[PDB]
RNA sequence: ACGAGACUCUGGCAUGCUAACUAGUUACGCGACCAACUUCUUAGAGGGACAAGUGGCGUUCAGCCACCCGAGAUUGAGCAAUAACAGGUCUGUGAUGCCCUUAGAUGUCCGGGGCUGCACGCGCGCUACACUGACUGGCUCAGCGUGUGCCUACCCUACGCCGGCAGGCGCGGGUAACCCGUUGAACCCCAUUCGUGAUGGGGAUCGGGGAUUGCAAUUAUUC
């Protein structure tokens, strides 16, 4: 129950720059496509256990997860695990990275504005696009 | 509160005045005799009448009561 | 003519297809157990039907 | 003089039965086991790997309640709140393609099979075999 | 089969129990084996309605009740005996159903 | 020739089939203290060690234990052990041993013979529940 | 794990840390002082116990020593007769303040 | 605002804090977590390693407070 | 003499009673040494609680307080007095008294704008703060109830196409303690966990997988 790995005051995974204060392996909110049941499934598929010591966990497991997500369509694993699926401009789910790029693509609002639709303005003003009622309840969104 | 109304009070008074022979001091025996010698249309009211009959029997075993 | 108009697209949930069997009123209908009375007519006839107040 | 398979507390009983069923060595789980959510009330996927073995033994007991065993009654053990956002709750279950794949892996095991009228039924010969195995692991190296 | 069932249903218990006792006594007058009266859980019909005909006043509701009591007695006898025991000038309200099953 | 009042409380139950035989005590349908919820094992440990083996050396017990709810079937196991012991000693040996050992068991605690009569009460008139009322405006 | 007797502290902090007087309201108005009273010890000791429920919670609530592990201090809060507590000395500060009215 | 403690495993510094647990009157994961201000899971791992060494016996398990004792 | 009480319904209790082939079972029982006169569920002619016993307060009255014993010791509701009000209802009723408009009858016809806005003019509503909140799916859980032709064309539901289950189609059961169902995409729990609180802990919108099939839903249906 010993490991010769050395504590690293600086660690780098995906070029993010965020406050490293707490533990790891489920504060991966900086990592976009790992965590919860899918990461549990991958780790169980890798046949690893929890007989080590928590607190000091390295990042190789999540690197392997992203490596398998580089070619996820080969093994026919249930393919509802990527973020934006069945989008226009491609019949597949390609790779992207870096922050400042994903949050925008969570709302692919170029073609829906180009079509001269109410949807572009519904999305743009920070208001409802499906119709959340906004006069007595439903006041969250700008505070 | 547990104040007995005129119904149970008057029924107990009449039962004691008319069948003082049979009534005793026990609630169970007073209950049985009250059921026998009177047509009490409810069992709760019968039990209340028997309880007040027992209370008044204790009262009159210690002297005369005016009712 | 008549068949060119009638029975084209089914009205599967007609509120106007139901009425109180006593006064032929649209509203307050009691369809449970097949009463098919409005609530006022039911209150008038509740004792005769067999429904009585206990609780 | 005749041992019942529901004789020990079912935790270690199903644990040992699953140990036997995995020690047979002829059956390896397919690739549609854990990535299925089954029901909503969970947060994670099957991780034990003996989930198939438990499904079959539990299903047997389900008959020790009634014929034509099916999954919804089996999964009604834990009900209460299931807050699902903007719509009320449901009553637990799993998936039927999972059941079909477990059946495809279950043929040749004489454990649990369908019937002609709808539902499941018990395999008495395999029943006796597993009873004998459980009894003779209990009475040889568990209570001496 | 000679298994015949009689199902007794009424909204009140006094008359239903009177009819049940009458039929049990009748089947015991003759030397007949009779399965004792079996009581269904007496399903209760509820209709809750606003008391007002308009929509005015304190929201007050009527809680109407209708309880249906069901008993079934099992005995083995041909149809003529059942037909004879039915014609007893029955009291109103107790619906009698006989099935040869 | 049918002496059974079994063991119940709240929602659960346990059919106390008590009969003369070899005399070994069958409890929980499972080994003594490994119950999977684990919450209330120690209450079962009071009487079985208090009384002794010889008192229960002839009691062959066969109980069908059912019912969800810890406070129901737990403490109903103790109600059943007390009541089955009472009936066994009464119908088989005498009343004096019955009163002695039963007095010991039911003087350890009272709550055996009495369950909570508390039940959920009706949703009342013009309110979300039994006593709460909808908010009144002026 | 103890083997010895924890009885000393187990009794000797809480179960006579207890205060000796609480207060009550005066007349019909005036929220500036409180008339000192007492109770047969149970109500005042267990009012200290209730404020200690709040105090031990806040010693756990958003704090380091958590619930299901304060067994030593809880046995202290339970057993019998001497004085070391904290919310009880809060109650004793209030005790003296309201007791200046005798 | 988590504190900074020496967690590195060295030829020297590693064997200077692992033989300090039995130097206290009260030695539990709770006491170590409230006093020495390092994860209680580290103390649980330490007692697990002690159990592996063969000087105690494990009884039951929990996510916070485990039972390891001895009868010799 | 009404009203109050009594009363009716409803809960809470039977080593008791009446009996059930839909719950429940005994050494001339198998599928296993390597037709119990009925009690858990159901429901009936009954029983049980009376301030009844004791102690203390009370022109030693009515009664009050406490305590054994007890399943239970002011115990859910329903019903509820003349005079009342210009309270609401003529839009529930060929229940009902007439001053009195209009043809744009307050009839029909999957037909058809709003009201599903956002500087709020108001009212009823939709929501828990940490090892307690939620996942391991690793042990038998709840109902209260509903469910298919006078009208009538509209009922509740038990396997597979299979992406990961309601489910677009074949399939049986149930006019129901017989089927749904010992209530079929639910406990609150838990080897995904918080070491002292913005993290794993409880969701600001809002995008894809096949959509229960309701012309429309967006100008209210659908993981």
Could you state the CATH homologous superfamily of chain B?
Ribosomal protein S17
SSE pattern of chain B, N- to C-terminal: HHH
Q: Strand content of the residues of chain F, in percent?
A: 5-15%
Q: Write the element-wise H/E pattern of chain F from the N-terminal end onward.
A: EEEHEEHHH
Q: Kindly give the count of domains of chain B.
A: 1
PDB class: ribosome
Keywords: 40S, Nsp1, betacoronaviruses, cryo-EM, ribosome
Entry title: SARSr-MpCoV-GX Nsp1 bound to the Human 40S Ribosomal subunit-State1
Chain A: Small ribosomal subunit protein uS13
What does this structure look like?
The structure is cut from a larger assembly and holds 8 protein chains of 8 kinds. With 143 residues, chain A is an all-alpha fold. Chain A contains 5 helices and no strands. Chain A is extended and about 60 Å long. Chain B is mainly alpha-helical. Chain B has a single domain, classed as Orthogonal Bundle (Diphtheria Toxin Repressor, domain 2), CATH 1.10.60.20. Chain G has a two-stranded antiparallel sheet with strand order 1-2. Classes of the chains: A mainly alpha (143), B mainly alpha (67), C alpha+beta (55), D mainly alpha (144), E alpha+beta (101), F alpha+beta (138), G mainly alpha (102), H alpha+beta (72). The structure holds one RNA strand of 223 nucleotides. Chain C: GO terms for molecular function: structural constituent of ribosome; zinc ion binding. Chain C: Its cofactor is Zn(2+). Chain C: Component of the 40S small ribosomal subunit. Chain C: Belongs to the universal ribosomal protein uS14 family.
Quick gist of this model?
By secondary structure, chain A is an all-alpha fold.
List keywords for this structure.
part of a larger assembly; 8 chains; A: mainly alpha; 2 domains; 5 helices; B: 67 residues; mainly alpha; Diphtheria Toxin Repressor, domain 2; 63% helix; RNA-binding; Ribosomal_uS9 (chain F)
List the helices and strands and how they pair.
This is part of a larger assembly, with eight protein chains of eight kinds.
Chain A: H1 36-45, H2 60-70, H3 102-105, H4 111-114, H5 118-124
Chain D: H1 10-23, H2 51-63, H3 71-74, H4 96-106, E1 112-114, E2 120-122, H5 124-141
Antiparallel strand pairs in D: 1-2
Chain E: E1 3-10, H1 13-29, E2 34-39, E3 44-50, E4 61-67, E5 69-76, H2 79-86, E6 95-100
Antiparallel strand pairs in E: 1-5, 1-6, 2-5, 3-4
The structure holds one RNA strand of 223 nucleotides.
PDB class: ribosome
Keywords: 40S, Nsp1, betacoronaviruses, cryo-EM, ribosome
Entry title: SARSr-MpCoV-GX Nsp1 bound to the Human 40S Ribosomal subunit-State1
């Amino acid at each position: 129950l010993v490991i010769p790995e050395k504590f690293q005051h600086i660690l780098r995974v995906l070029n993010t720059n965020i406050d490293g204060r707490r533990k790891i392996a489920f504060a991966i909110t900086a990592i976009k496509g790992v965590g919860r049941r899918y990461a549990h499934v991958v780790l169980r598929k890798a046949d690893i256990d929890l007989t080590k010591r928590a607190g000091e966990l390295t990042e190789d497991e999540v690197e392997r997860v992203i490596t398998i997500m580089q070619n996820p369509r080969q093994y026919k694993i249930p393919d509802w695990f990527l973020n934006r699926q069945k989008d226009v401009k491609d019949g597949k789910y390609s790779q992207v990275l870096a922050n400042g790029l994903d949050n925008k693509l969570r709302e692919d609002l170029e073609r829906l504005k180009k079509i001269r639709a109410h949807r572009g303005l519904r999305h743009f003003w920070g208001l409802r696009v499906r119709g959340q009622h906004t006069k007595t309840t439903g006041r969250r969104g700008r505070t | 509160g547990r104040v007995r109304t005129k119904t149970v009070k008057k029924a107990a008074r009449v039962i004691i005045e008319k069948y003082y022979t049979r009534l005793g001091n026990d609630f169970h025996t007073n209950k049985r005799v009250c059921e026998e010698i009177a047509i009490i249309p409810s069992k709760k009211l019968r039990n209340k009448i028997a309880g007040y009959v027992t209370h008044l029997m204790k009262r009159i075993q210690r002297g005369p009561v005016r009712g | 003519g008549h068949q060119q108009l009638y029975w084209s697209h089914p009205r599967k949930f007609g509120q106007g297809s139901r009425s109180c069997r006593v006064c032929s009123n649209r509203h307050g209908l009691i369809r449970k157990y097949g009463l098919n009375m409005c609530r006022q007519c039911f209150r008038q006839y509740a004792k005769d039907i067999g429904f009585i107040k206990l609780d | 003089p005749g041992v019942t398979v529901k004789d020990v507390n079912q935790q270690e009983f199903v644990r040992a039965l699953a140990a036997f069923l995995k020690k047979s060595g002829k059956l390896k789980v397919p690739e549609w086991v854990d990535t299925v959510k089954l029901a909503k009330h969970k947060e994670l996927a099957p991780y034990d790997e003996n989930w198939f073995y438990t499904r079959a033994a539990s299903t047997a007991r389900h008959l020790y309640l009634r014929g034509g065993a099916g999954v919804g009654s089996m999964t009604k053990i834990y009900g209460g709140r299931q807050r699902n956002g903007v719509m009320p709750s449901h009553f637990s279950r799993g998936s039927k393609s999972v059941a079909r794949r477990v059946l495809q892996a279950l043929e040749g095991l004489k454990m649990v099979e369908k019937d002609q009228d709808g539902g499941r039924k018990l395999t008495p010969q395999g029943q006796r075999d597993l009873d004998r195995i459980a009894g003779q692991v209990a009475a040889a190296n568990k209570k001496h | 089969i000679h298994r015949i069932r009689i199902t007794l249903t009424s909204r009140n218990v006094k008359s239903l129990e009177k009819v049940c006792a009458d039929l049990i006594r009748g089947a015991k007058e003759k030397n007949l084996k009779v399965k004792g009266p079996v009581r269904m859980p007496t399903k209760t019909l509820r209709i809750t309605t606003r008391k007002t005909p308009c929509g005015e006043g304190s929201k007050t509701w009527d809680r109407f009740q209708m309880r249906i009591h069901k008993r079934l007695i099992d005995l083995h006898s041909p149809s003529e005996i059942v037909k004879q025991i039915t014609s007893i000038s029955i009291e109103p309200g107790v619906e009698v159903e006989v099935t040869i099953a | 020739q049918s002496v059974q009042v079994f063991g119940r409380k709240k929602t659960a139950t346990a059919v106390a089939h008590c009969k003369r035989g070899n005399g070994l005590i069958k409890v929980n349908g499972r080994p003594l203290e490994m119950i999977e919820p684990r919450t209330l094992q120690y209450k079962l440990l009071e009487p079985v060690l208090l009384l002794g083996k010889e008192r229960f050396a002839g009691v062959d017990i066969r109980v069908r234990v059912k019912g969800g709810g810890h406070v129901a079937q737990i403490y109903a196991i103790r109600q059943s052990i007390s009541k089955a012991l009472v009936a066994y000693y009464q119908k088989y040996v005498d009343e004096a041993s019955k009163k002695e050992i039963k007095d010991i068991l039911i003087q350890y605690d009272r709550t055996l013979l009495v369950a909570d009569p508390r039940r959920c009460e009706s949703k009342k008139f013009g309110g979300p529940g039994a006593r709460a009322r909808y908010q009144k405006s002026y | 794990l103890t083997g010895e007797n924890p009885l000393q502290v187990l009794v000797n902090a809480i179960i006579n840390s207890g205060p000796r007087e609480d207060s009550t309201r005066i007349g019909r108005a005036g929220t500036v002082r409180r008339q000192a009273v007492d109770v047969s010890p149970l109500r005042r000791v267990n009012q200290a116990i209730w404020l200690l429920c709040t105090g031990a919670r806040e010693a756990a609530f958003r704090n380091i020593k958590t619930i299901a592990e304060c067994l030593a201090d809880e046995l202290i809060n339970a057993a019998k007769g001497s004085s070391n507590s904290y919310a009880i000395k809060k109650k004793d500060e209030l005790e003296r303040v309201a007791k200046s009215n005798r | 605002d988590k504190l900074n403690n020496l967690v590195l495993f060295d030829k020297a510094t590693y064997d200077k804090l692992c033989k300090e647990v039995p130097n206290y009157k009260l030695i539990t994961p709770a006491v170590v977590s409230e006093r020495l201000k390092i994860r209680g899971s580290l103390a649980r791992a330490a007692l697990q390693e002690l159990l592996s060494k063969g000087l105690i016996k494990l009884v039951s398990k929990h996510r916070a407070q485990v039972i390891y004792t001895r009868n010799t």
